[PDB]
A and B are shown apart, each in its own frame.
Chain A
């Protein structure tokens, strides 16, 4: 129950950013590979550096 809470909390984060984007264009101009299947947490990789998330600003 707390898992669905957390998951769609992140979903609402993503949707509110994606709905910020069009008025941002009008009025003006994330850990997916680092997710661990076996456990909640953040596992290091060798090809890529330590875990991060880049969401660029327009």
Chain B
């Protein structure tokens, strides 16, 4: 199912060339879940994202 979720805080640029951003993401329908996601493109606090499959958390060192 398609899910929607607000960015809370950005953790920082991740990836080999710094092409992704690791970020703290929380849902709006239930403002209790809190996940780590990695995104492509410029992000800031207050952006809201369309998550296709909202189970796993992103992971990069």
A touches B in complex, CB < 8 A: no
Q: Which residues of A contact B (CB under 8 A)?
A: none
B contact residues vs A (CB 8 Å cutoff):
none
